[PDB]
Amino acid sequence: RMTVGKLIELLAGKAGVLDGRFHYGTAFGGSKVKDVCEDLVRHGYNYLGK
Amino acid sequence: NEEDDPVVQEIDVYLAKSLAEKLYLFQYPVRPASMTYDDIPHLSAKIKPKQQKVELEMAIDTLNPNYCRSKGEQIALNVDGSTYSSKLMDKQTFCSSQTTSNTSRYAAALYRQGELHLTPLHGILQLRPSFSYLDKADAKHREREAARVQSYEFLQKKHAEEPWVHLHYYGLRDSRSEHERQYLLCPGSSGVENTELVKSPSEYLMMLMPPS
Amino acid sequence: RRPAPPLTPGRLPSIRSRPKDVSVAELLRELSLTKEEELLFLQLPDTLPGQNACTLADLTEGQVGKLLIRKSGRVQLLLGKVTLDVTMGTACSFLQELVSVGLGDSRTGEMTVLGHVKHKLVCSPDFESLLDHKHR
Amino acid sequence: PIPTVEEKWRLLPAFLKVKGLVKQHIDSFNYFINVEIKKIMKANEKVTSDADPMWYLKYLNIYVGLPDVEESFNVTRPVSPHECRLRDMTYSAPITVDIEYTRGSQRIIRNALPIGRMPIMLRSSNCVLTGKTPAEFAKLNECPLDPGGYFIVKGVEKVILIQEQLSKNRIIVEADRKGAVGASVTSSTHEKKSRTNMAVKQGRFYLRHNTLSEDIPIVIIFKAMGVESDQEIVQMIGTEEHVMAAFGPSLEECQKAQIFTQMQALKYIGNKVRRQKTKIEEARELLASTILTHVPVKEFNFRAKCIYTAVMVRRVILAQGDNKVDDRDYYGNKRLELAGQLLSLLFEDLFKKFNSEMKKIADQVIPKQRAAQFDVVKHMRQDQITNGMVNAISTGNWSLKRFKMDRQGVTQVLSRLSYISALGMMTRISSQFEKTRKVSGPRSLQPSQWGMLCPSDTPEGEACGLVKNLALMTHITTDMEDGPIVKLASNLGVEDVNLLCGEELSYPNVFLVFLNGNILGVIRDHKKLVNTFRLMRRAGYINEFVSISTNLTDRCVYISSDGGRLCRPYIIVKKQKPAVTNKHMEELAQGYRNFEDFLHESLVEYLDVNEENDCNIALYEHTINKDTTHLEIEPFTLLGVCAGLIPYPHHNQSPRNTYQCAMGKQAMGTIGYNQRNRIDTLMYLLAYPQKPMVKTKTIELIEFEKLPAGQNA
Amino acid sequence: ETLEALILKELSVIRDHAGSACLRELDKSNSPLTMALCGSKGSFINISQMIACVGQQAISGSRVPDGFENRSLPHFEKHSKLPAAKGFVANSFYSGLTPTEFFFHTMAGREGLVDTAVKTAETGYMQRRLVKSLEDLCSQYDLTVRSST
Amino acid sequence: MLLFCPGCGNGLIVEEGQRCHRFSCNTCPYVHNITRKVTNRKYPKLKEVDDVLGGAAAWENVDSTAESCPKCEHPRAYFMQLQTRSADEPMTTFYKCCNAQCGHRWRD
Amino acid sequence: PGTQMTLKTFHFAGVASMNITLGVPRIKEIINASKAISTPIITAQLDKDDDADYARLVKGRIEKTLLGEISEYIEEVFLPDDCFILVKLSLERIRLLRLEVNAETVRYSICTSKLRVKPGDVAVHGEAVVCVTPRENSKSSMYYVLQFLKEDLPKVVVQGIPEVSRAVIHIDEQSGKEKYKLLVEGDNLRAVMATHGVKGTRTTSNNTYEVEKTLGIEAARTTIINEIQYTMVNHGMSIDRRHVMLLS
RNA sequence: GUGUC
DNA sequence: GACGAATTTGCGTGTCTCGACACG
DNA sequence: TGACACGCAAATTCGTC
Numbered sequence A: 001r002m003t004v005g006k007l008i009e010l011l012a013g014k015a016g017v018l019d020g021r022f023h024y025g026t027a028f029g030g031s032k033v034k035d036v037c038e039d040l041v042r043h044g045y046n047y048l049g050k
Numbered sequence B: 001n002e003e004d005d006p007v008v009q010e011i012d013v014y015l016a017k018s019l020a021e022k023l024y025l026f027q028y029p030v031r032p033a034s035m036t037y038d039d040i041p042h043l044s045a046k047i048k049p050k051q052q053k054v055e056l057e058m059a060i061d062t063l064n065p066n067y068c069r070s071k072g073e074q075i076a077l078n079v080d081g082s083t084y085s086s087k088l089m090d091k092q093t094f095c096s097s098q099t100t101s102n103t104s105r106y107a108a109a110l111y112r113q114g115e116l117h118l119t120p121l122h123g124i125l126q127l128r129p130s131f132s133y134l135d136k137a138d139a140k141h142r143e144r145e146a147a148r149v150q151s152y153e154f155l156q157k158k159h160a161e162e163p164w165v166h167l168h169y170y171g172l173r174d175s176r177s178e179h180e181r182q183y184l185l186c187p188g189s190s191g192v193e194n195t196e197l198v199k200s201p202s203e204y205l206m207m208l209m210p211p212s
Numbered sequence C: 001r002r003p004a005p006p007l008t009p010g011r012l013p014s015i016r017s018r019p020k021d022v023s024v025a026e027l028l029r030e031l032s033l034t035k036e037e038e039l040l041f042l043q044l045p046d047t048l049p050g051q052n053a054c055t056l057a058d059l060t061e062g063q064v065g066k067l068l069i070r071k072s073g074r075v076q077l078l079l080g081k082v083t084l085d086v087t088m089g090t091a092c093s094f095l096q097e098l099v100s101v102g103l104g105d106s107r108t109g110e111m112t113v114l115g116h117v118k119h120k121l122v123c124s125p126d127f128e129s130l131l132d133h134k135h136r
Numbered sequence D: 001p002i003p004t005v006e007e008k009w010r011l012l013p014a015f016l017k018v019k020g021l022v023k024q025h026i027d028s029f030n031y032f033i034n035v036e037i038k039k040i041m042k043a044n045e046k047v048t049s050d051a052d053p054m055w056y057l058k059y060l061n062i063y064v065g066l067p068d069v070e071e072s073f074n075v076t077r078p079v080s081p082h083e084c085r086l087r088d089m090t091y092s093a094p095i096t097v098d099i100e101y102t103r104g105s106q107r108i109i110r111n112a113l114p115i116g117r118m119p120i121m122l123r124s125s126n127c128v129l130t131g132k133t134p135a136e137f138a139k140l141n142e143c144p145l146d147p148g149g150y151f152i153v154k155g156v157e158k159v160i161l162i163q164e165q166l167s168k169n170r171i172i173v174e175a176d177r178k179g180a181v182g183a184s185v186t187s188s189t190h191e192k193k194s195r196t197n198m199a200v201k202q203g204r205f206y207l208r209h210n211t212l213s214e215d216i217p218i219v220i221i222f223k224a225m226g227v228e229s230d231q232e233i234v235q236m237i238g239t240e241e242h243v244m245a246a247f248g249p250s251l252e253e254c255q256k257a258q259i260f261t262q263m264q265a266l267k268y269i270g271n272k273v274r275r276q277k278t279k280i281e282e283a284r285e286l287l288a289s290t291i292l293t294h295v296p297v298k299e300f301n302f303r304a305k306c307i308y309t310a311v312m313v314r315r316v317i318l319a320q321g322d323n324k325v326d327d328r329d330y331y332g333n334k335r336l337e338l339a340g341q342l343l344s345l346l347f348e349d350l351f352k353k354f355n356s357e358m359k360k361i362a363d364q365v366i367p368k369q370r371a372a373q374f375d376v377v378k379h380m381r382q383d384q385i386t387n388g389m390v391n392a393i394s395t396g397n398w399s400l401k402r403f404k405m406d407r408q409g410v411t412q413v414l415s416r417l418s419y420i421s422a423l424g425m426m427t428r429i430s431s432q433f434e435k436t437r438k439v440s441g442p443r444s445l446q447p448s449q450w451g452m453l454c455p456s457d458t459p460e461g462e463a464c465g466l467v468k469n470l471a472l473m474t475h476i477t478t479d480m481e482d483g484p485i486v487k488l489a490s491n492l493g494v495e496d497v498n499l500l501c502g503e504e505l506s507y508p509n510v511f512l513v514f515l516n517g518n519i520l521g522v523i524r525d526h527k528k529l530v531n532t533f534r535l536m537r538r539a540g541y542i543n544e545f546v547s548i549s550t551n552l553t554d555r556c557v558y559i560s561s562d563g564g565r566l567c568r569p570y571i572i573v574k575k576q577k578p579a580v581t582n583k584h585m586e587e588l589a590q591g592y593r594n595f596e597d598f599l600h601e602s603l604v605e606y607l608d609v610n611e612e613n614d615c616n617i618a619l620y621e622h623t624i625n626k627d628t629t630h631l632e633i634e635p636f637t638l639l640g641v642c643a644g645l646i647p648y649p650h651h652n653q654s655p656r657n658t659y660q661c662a663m664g665k666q667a668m669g670t671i672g673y674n675q676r677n678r679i680d681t682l683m684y685l686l687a688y689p690q691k692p693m694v695k696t697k698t699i700e701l702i703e704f705e706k707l708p709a710g711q712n713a
Numbered sequence E: 001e002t003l004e005a006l007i008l009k010e011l012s013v014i015r016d017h018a019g020s021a022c023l024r025e026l027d028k029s030n031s032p033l034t035m036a037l038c039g040s041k042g043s044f045i046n047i048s049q050m051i052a053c054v055g056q057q058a059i060s061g062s063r064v065p066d067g068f069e070n071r072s073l074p075h076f077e078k079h080s081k082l083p084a085a086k087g088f089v090a091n092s093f094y095s096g097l098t099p100t101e102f103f104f105h106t107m108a109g110r111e112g113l114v115d116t117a118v119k120t121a122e123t124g125y126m127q128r129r130l131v132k133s134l135e136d137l138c139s140q141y142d143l144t145v146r147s148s149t
Numbered sequence F: 001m002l003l004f005c006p007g008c009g010n011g012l013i014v015e016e017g018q019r020c021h022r023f024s025c026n027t028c029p030y031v032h033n034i035t036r037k038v039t040n041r042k043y044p045k046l047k048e049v050d051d052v053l054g055g056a057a058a059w060e061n062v063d064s065t066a067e068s069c070p071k072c073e074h075p076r077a078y079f080m081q082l083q084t085r086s087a088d089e090p091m092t093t094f095y096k097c098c099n100a101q102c103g104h105r106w107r108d
Numbered sequence G: 001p002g003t004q005m006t007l008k009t010f011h012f013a014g015v016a017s018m019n020i021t022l023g024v025p026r027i028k029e030i031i032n033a034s035k036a037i038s039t040p041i042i043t044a045q046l047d048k049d050d051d052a053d054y055a056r057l058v059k060g061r062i063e064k065t066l067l068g069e070i071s072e073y074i075e076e077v078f079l080p081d082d083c084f085i086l087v088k089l090s091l092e093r094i095r096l097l098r099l100e101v102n103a104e105t106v107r108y109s110i111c112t113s114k115l116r117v118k119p120g121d122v123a124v125h126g127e128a129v130v131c132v133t134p135r136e137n138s139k140s141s142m143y144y145v146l147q148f149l150k151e152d153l154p155k156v157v158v159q160g161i162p163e164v165s166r167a168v169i170h171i172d173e174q175s176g177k178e179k180y181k182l183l184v185e186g187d188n189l190r191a192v193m194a195t196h197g198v199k200g201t202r203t204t205s206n207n208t209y210e211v212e213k214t215l216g217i218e219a220a221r222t223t224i225i226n227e228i229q230y231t232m233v234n235h236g237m238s239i240d241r242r243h244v245m246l247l248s
Numbered sequence H: 001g002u003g004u005c
Numbered sequence I: 001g002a003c004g005a006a007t008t009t010g011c012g013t014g015t016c017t018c019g020a021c022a023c024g
Numbered sequence J: 001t002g003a004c005a006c007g008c009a010a011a012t013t014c015g016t017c
């Protein structure tokens, strides 16, 4: 199926429910995977998905 | 933008209503600009100013080194079976059509030594050679051998309501032509007058485009 | 052999046996340096500025125009305050002549040929300067 | 680094607040019941009988009221949409007219004369559901988030789908099974739909129209129009070496047949013409106002028509010998059709029927009378109008043989499965082609459409492109007049076509002016023309919805002002830079300087598909070059309503995007704020709807966070 | 025509080299790479398209055709015969496609979605036309095939 | 070519006269004498000799790869990439070509 | 296989841009067995397989060559005497193309052509300059006939097979082997095979009706088995020989 | 007519 | 020189143009 | 809106009185 937006959406949703704010996922922009993964470290979880 | 100050040429413009009322521009789209029509002798000229309808007939040579009399006498018998007062065809018929009845913008311009004269045009006309003398010929030959809505015939009768005017021709060299050239050239007001019309662009643009 | 079969594509030469456009400024310059006298057919904008419309018929007689020739520019007509630009269009290739028709009492009339026209110019007001003045 | 303004994302909400998504469906109807309804009344204005010219009636003014219901006996009380939805009633308001009729000898002017009813939209101007407050919206038992735009007939919600059709009053030149052929379709306001076509075979042009028996040579048509001499014919066609080798044969076969006068050509045509009054007048009036009626003739002058046919023949000649062909896949030519003009045609046909048959109701009574005076308001009826309107809306059979048309499947019941299925159906567009396997071009995604129709939004199945949806940012232009436009074009210095002959149009410098498929004249140096017209449009004098384009391959400028064009705002830039700055948008954030004055300050402008053909648009502000003319506001507005719910659409593949935008309308959830009161046939609801964590800005634009149809897990 | 294919082989080389250098950069426990080695659901093409680059989106076995006049989109230049302009996409699915790249990618997705809708009709027609002629041909007991006659 | 008459405005056809051939027409009396020489030069577009198609020079255009072929034990290999939908879900197919003394074509 | 056979010409490359129908349309054409086919492809082998300029010489033999394709310039004279048309045949343009066309060949070609002209008013003045005199008879004047004679002289062929349209030579190589194969795009197999250059025994066609009427009915059952198998191997499908042999 | 395979 | 006979070719018209399920 | 197999029919050539 070649669907990469699913994993990105899962990551953003996890980071949002951990932090407590909705993350923007609009087309041709939104949020990247560089500032969100480094925010998932402050809490104590793994950085990408594991 | 200031590079336009040094080189500034001045040209005066005049307008006259002396020949504006009596002025008609003739157009000849069938003829190349190289050749001329004022050299060929003209036998008659006909006008109706009520509908701006001009009918001209030109006189050509009957027996010149370029003429086939065999075809000529045949066409003469065809039209004979009166239009022509000779044995062959020696006349050509040109018919007109009224174009741009609302002729106010178009004006003729003459450039003398240093002054320009603009005369308003009454009407612009197009002269075209018609071929209807064969229509009547063929129709008469067939006659001999055989035997509220607004339509076109109403306007044909409307055209038939008016009488017709006959005109004389004056061409290349005539004292009358130079007289008319002077009458359209002579401005009368040779002195430089001021305060004829003042309209700032803020008023002209508002007059051009109505807000309503 | 004056009467020769003319050509539609080469109506300008019509040689058959033995196009260049010019600016109005240059054109009037060479027309003036030869000191000749020829007629010109000019088109004016509708509803001229005046005192409802205003054409040349509802106007006066005398000097009401001023032409200006700018360096590296165009030819610019003035009536004191209004500004117009004039330029040549649809260079005619056929015959165009103007005559004077004269009507007498009932039928007797005189028709005299004045001259021919071989150049058509068109003049119109540039709305750029009008909008620039109105905006400022 | 380049100065970048990260503020232009607030222009889009302010623009959708004015018009956009569904507000145009109401704009087409609010303009129709205020402009066209009286134009039709003025069209059919005087009607009289022929028994004796003494009886006649006159139409002074016509207007409609507010939604009212007629109960048992003179009971007219204001009804709400929910009451009509529960009682299986129909939402309609009466049309009261003020006409005058002469009975006996004196004239009677009866004011407020009812003639019938007419349905009213839910969020129109005459309805009660406008300018209210949510507290008052809850008083009438209606969801405030309901976009509206449908019709309530017999307790069902019916919406009319937008239908696309081809452009009229234009010349097409396409190739068929043997060679190339030019065609012209003509249809003005008056009912006259004609389709003429010129074809090439054996190096001979032939004109085909269904009124003629067989082919008529083009030179014969020319000689019949009025141009007699064969030299000026070729002059009007074209003065070139290669165009004469292809036009000589036709000239010589024309010389073969003995036709040299206008009467000969007219008799030839009249003999060719069959119709089920002489032959000459038949052929004359047939060439006058039958073939091309979009080119009006003042007295009897066929000159504009013959120059039009000549430029058509020139376009066909230049198409001949090359591989330059016109396609129907271009959307700059395709026009859209809303529910306004359909209702206009229906209403004018019903009005003409009602005027023409009632003319016969009092035509069998005048000789066979009993008294001196005849009353007509008692010889009056108010059921045919209501019956016809309700039948056309509910049934869906648009059958107008007065207009020579039959259309089926135009109105459909509004989908009330979810909140997205209801709004997404309002932007659904239907095509004119039927659902067949032959089509591959129109179904294929065209490069022409950019930001007007969602590419991903399309149902997968049989119809794979015949059904399309509109984009977020686009506008449908309504119709205008052309008086001031033609006046300003004439003042700019455009030339009259009736003065110059056929030779000057072959000149490369000469450019022709086209306005809604009409030749205005010849213009030189078209760049100044385009620049001045654009400046005047940016000024504010001319309306903003007037397109202008130029084509150099045929050297013609087109001026389009017909209604039904696609328009989306673009930011203007001046030589390196966007005119919109930070200080201009800070005021917008403050509460002033909205969209209309932004358009009045010459900062943004609308462009069409054909006008953006000759323009350079920059995606971002870092890609702005020296030839870019306009700047696209945002690139994420290209996605549609159903495609705005997919997180990271660029990350996903287009088949998955299509599957998801198709499944988004089938997903079950909450419907609205009043789901307990409304009683629909089938309703699917959820128990505890959650809120999407990874939301989109399009979700906030539609306020999908108030009615979600899913859950987080 | 020669220029169309001379640069078409220059773009596929970049994608192939990137995909080949990506294989030496991946681990031995990569789930997509593991599925590709197994061959259950996936291939190396999908891996190279998701990691390195998508490649070039071909339409009708050729480049994107012009759509306004001598240019596909109005954002590019007139008579612009450039790879990245016409039909070459550079960003991968992980990085993020641009609007012009997303449009060129969804153009090819509609090429296959309209093709799978039309095949069924004439395929079923040719099937029901082919069965109606061969449905009684049987083998006898003497090793001979005959018809009803 | 295209020749018209100046008097009437119609076209002319050449036919024999009494002593010599004549430029005649069927609308107005007008005949021009045919003299020493009248002719025009035309240049029809002449045909080109076309190219020889096929060969290894044409295969030099497309890029090859390095992959063995289990028919003649050669790393010589040309690769082709095509799109096609299978029965379940689309998957990119690839064609294999051997650049050797046999030169066969397979589709995996 | 046919349901999974719905993409167009697969072998996409600049090497040979030959519009060949292969897929469900070609299978449908085979099943329908139509007389008039699309994409005519005829393969022929040469006797001299290494000599290439010889293959060029035979390539010019089987190919429709027009007269306007050879004619460098044509003229219509006008003089006090009776006029005529004069065509100047170019010799060098035949030389680098290596045709068997002389002035007498063109004269005899026009003398047996469909246009109304017989050897009464056609002569050869010099080396490669031909003259034709328009006569005055049987429909109308000679001027109107002159306009009909100037439009069909290029249409009149000078050599080749008229319905044969285009031919190309293919180079097939090996370790040290080289062959030149003639690809003719036409239908008249009996005419392209009955020549000197191409080897008449080894030459195959694509139209079933042409091989049926030229070779026979038993030889047409073999070309339809290879035609179907050639359409299935480029798709990656697998059918057995017996299924095709039973249908054939 | 709409929806799915 | 003039009339009956048989050939090749442009043009007229009819038939469909996969399956299944559910709801109003 | 593609497919060509049937008739229906007019231009044209070899032939013999």
Ligand SMILES: [Zn+2]
Pocket (backbone or CB within 6 Å): F005, F008, F009, F010, F011, F025, F026, F027, F028, F030
């Ligand atoms: Zn003549």
Ligand SMILES: [Zn+2]
Pocket (backbone or CB within 6 Å): F069, F071, F072, F098, F099, F100, F102, F103, F104
């Ligand atoms: Zn091998």
